[PDB]
Design an enzyme around this catalytic site. Structure first.
Site, PDB file in Angstrom:
ATOM      1  CD  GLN A 151      -2.679  -1.257   2.461  1.00  0.00           C
ATOM      2  OE1 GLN A 151      -3.816  -0.830   2.225  1.00  0.00           O
ATOM      3  NE2 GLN A 151      -2.336  -1.387   3.660  1.00  0.00           N
ATOM      4  CB  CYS A 177     -11.425   1.440  11.025  1.00  0.00           C
ATOM      5  SG  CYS A 177     -13.054   2.120  10.587  1.00  0.00           S
ATOM      6  CG  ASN A 206      -4.807   0.341   5.885  1.00  0.00           C
ATOM      7  OD1 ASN A 206      -3.962  -0.427   6.592  1.00  0.00           O
ATOM      8  ND2 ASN A 206      -5.333   0.325   4.823  1.00  0.00           N
ATOM      9  CG  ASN A 222     -14.085  -5.894  13.000  1.00  0.00           C
ATOM     10  OD1 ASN A 222     -14.144  -5.516  14.261  1.00  0.00           O
ATOM     11  ND2 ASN A 222     -13.041  -6.090  12.221  1.00  0.00           N
ATOM     12  CG  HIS A 241     -13.756  -9.811  16.159  1.00  0.00           C
ATOM     13  ND1 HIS A 241     -12.410  -9.839  15.132  1.00  0.00           N
ATOM     14  CD2 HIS A 241     -14.040  -8.206  15.900  1.00  0.00           C
ATOM     15  CE1 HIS A 241     -12.355  -8.766  15.032  1.00  0.00           C
ATOM     16  NE2 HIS A 241     -13.103  -7.991  15.195  1.00  0.00           N
ATOM     17  CG  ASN A 263     -13.267 -10.670  11.502  1.00  0.00           C
ATOM     18  OD1 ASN A 263     -12.586 -10.802  10.493  1.00  0.00           O
ATOM     19  ND2 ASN A 263     -14.003  -9.726  11.783  1.00  0.00           N
ATOM     20  CD  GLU A 318      -8.316 -10.237   8.567  1.00  0.00           C
ATOM     21  OE1 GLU A 318      -9.366  -9.459   8.095  1.00  0.00           O
ATOM     22  OE2 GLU A 318      -7.008  -9.921   8.573  1.00  0.00           O
ATOM     23  CB  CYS A 335      -6.725  -9.551  11.753  1.00  0.00           C
ATOM     24  SG  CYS A 335      -8.202  -9.026  12.205  1.00  0.00           S
ATOM     25  N   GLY A 381      -8.760  -8.234  15.418  1.00  0.00           N
ATOM     26  CA  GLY A 381      -8.921  -9.696  16.014  1.00  0.00           C
ATOM     27  C   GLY A 381      -8.291  -9.618  17.177  1.00  0.00           C
TER      28      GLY A 381
HETATM   29 CL   LIG Z   1     -14.145  -7.029   8.977  1.00  0.00          CL
END
Ligand SMILES: [Cl-]
Ligand SMILES: [Cl-]
Ligand SMILES: [Cl-]
Ligand SMILES: [Cl-]
Ligand SMILES: [Cl-]
Ligand SMILES: [Mg+2]
Ligand SMILES: [Mg+2]
Ligand SMILES: [Mg+2]
Lengths: 159, 275
Positions: free
Chosen positions: B45, B74, B76, B158, B160, B191, B209, B218, B221
């Site tokens: 990236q 988010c 990153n 997210n 989990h 995840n 994931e 992750c 995670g």
């Molecule tokens: Cl996700």
């Protein structure tokens, strides 16, 4: 009369910082655009003298309200966009030659007074983060601003 | 010649560019060229540091992928970003306020040069996961194919599902992972974390994931594993998390508090490329 042979008026620009490393950002009178203070150098005066003169005129800050932290080693020019050049006024001014100063405001914020002259160039101000002016400056000054703020950065960080 | 750096964070290779003191416009064409390992630089990236859009923030930064598209995930690049602006003398702040495609963050550079991110408060309400269960339990029972499983469930923004495992090198992340990822009780999938508790303050982890399978690092995670482990009375307030791709350090004082994730960023190289 101060316009040089290329059409550039000698000029001083002012970056005023506080102790938190913010910089003073000024609103152009009756407009919604902002910039750092700057002003033309007069016949007779050095860059420093012009700087103090325009500083009080535009910001209301006296010699004892600030201390000079740095100035740019060389002159930095910007060209006006063609549509802004007033071609009928001889000598024609096509841009500004600039000597930039980095000041620290050592008095309280209440000392900033944007009405010491009968024709103020600004009608408000605020503190902004150090690099915000590089984005927000008008396009034709951005090259100069980027170079000035890069040059001043190490001094302002060290406080 | 445009200056850049290579940096490594959360198991990812970033090309990082100071677009604050440099005048550079990143068109999709230029990005695709820079991503070319032979014509350009090569990267997973591209992280571009820009002046802030807001006068109360220090910077803005964007992340682009090799296709030349802006990426909005988010947090990153946050560690590489914070270390880069300090290493390059763009700031001397230890708390750096920054806007991204996903909103704003306050990043803290610790004394050992690690970067700490406020990840928000973990949410165990099943409706917020989303998870099909009548009320929040510290431990849930789920049948995965011909198996029964004990797990914790939390949302870090997210979804989990964390499972305790006695050795992460042995666990069937390739079999149980897919079954729980798209399990019926996760309408929006989840995840799946495979957590080995080494010590109340030290876990090993692998993550299957949502949609992406097993990745190397992750962050959400790791946050979720520690949040469930703390909620289950198994973990201390500060946990070292060992992932395939490196180490993180999670800190959480429990409900009513935000969870913090601390991680490194390696300055790999500097370079220049004529545009
Ligand atoms: Cl996700
Ligand atoms: Cl005076
Ligand atoms: Cl910009
Ligand atoms: Cl990172
Ligand atoms: Cl079930
Ligand atoms: Mg002026
Ligand atoms: Mg003036
Ligand atoms: Mg004047």
């Amino acid at each position: 009369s101060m316009i040089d042979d290329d059409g550039y008026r000698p000029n001083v620009g002012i970056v005023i910082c506080n102790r938190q490393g913010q910089v003073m950002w000024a609103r152009r009178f009756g407009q919604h655009s902002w910039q750092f203070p700057q002003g033309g150098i007069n016949p007779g005066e050095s860059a420093e003298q012009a700087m103090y003169r325009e500083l009080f005129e535009e910001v209301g800050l006296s010699r004892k309200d600030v201390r000079i932290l740095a100035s740019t080693r060389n002159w930095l020019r910007y060209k006006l966009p063609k549509r802004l050049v007033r071609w009928d006024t001889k000598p024609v001014c096509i841009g500004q030659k600039q000597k930039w100063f980095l000041l620290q405001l050592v008095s309280g914020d209440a000392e900033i007074n944007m009405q010491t002259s009968s024709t103020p160039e600004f009608d408000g101000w605020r503190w902004v983060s150090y690099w915000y002016p590089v984005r927000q400056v008008v396009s034709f000054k951005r090259d100069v601003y980027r170079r000035v703020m890069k040059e001043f950065a190490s001094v302002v960080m060290s406080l | 010649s445009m200056q850049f750096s290579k940096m490594h964070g959360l198991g990812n290779d970033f090309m990082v560019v100071d677009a604050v003191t440099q005048n550079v416009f990143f068109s999709p064409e230029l990005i695709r060229r820079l991503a070319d390992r032979h014509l350009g630089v090569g990267f997973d990236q591209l992280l571009v540091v820009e002046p802030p859009y807001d006068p109360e923030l220090d910077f803005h930064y964007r992340i682009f992928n090799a296709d030349g598209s802006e990426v909005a995930q988010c947090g990153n690049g946050a560690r590489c970003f914070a270390r880069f602006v300090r290493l390059k003398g763009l700031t001397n702040k230890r708390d750096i306020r920054v806007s991204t495609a996903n909103g704003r963050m306050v990043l803290t550079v610790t004394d050992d040069d690690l970067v700490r991110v406020n990840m928000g408060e973990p949410n165990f309400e099943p409706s917020a996961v989303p998870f099909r269960a009548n009320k929040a339990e510290k431990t849930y029972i789920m049948r995965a194919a011909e198996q029964t499983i004990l797990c914790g469930v939390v949302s870090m923004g997210n979804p989990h599902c964390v499972i305790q495992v006695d050795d992460v090198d042995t666990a069937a992340v390739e079999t149980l992972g897919p079954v729980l990822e798209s399990h019926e009780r996760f309408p929006e999938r989840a995840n799946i974390g495979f957590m080995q508790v080494v010590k109340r303050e030290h876990i090993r982890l692998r993550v299957y994931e949502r949609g992406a399978g097993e990745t190397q690092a992750c962050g959400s995670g790791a946050c979720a594993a520690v949040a469930v482990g703390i909620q289950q009375g198994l973990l201390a307030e500060e946990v070292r998390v060992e992932l395939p791709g490196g180490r993180l350090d999670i800190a959480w004082k429990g409900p009513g508090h935000p969870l913090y994730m601390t991680g490194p960023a390696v300055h790999v190289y500097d370079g220049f490329i004529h545009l």
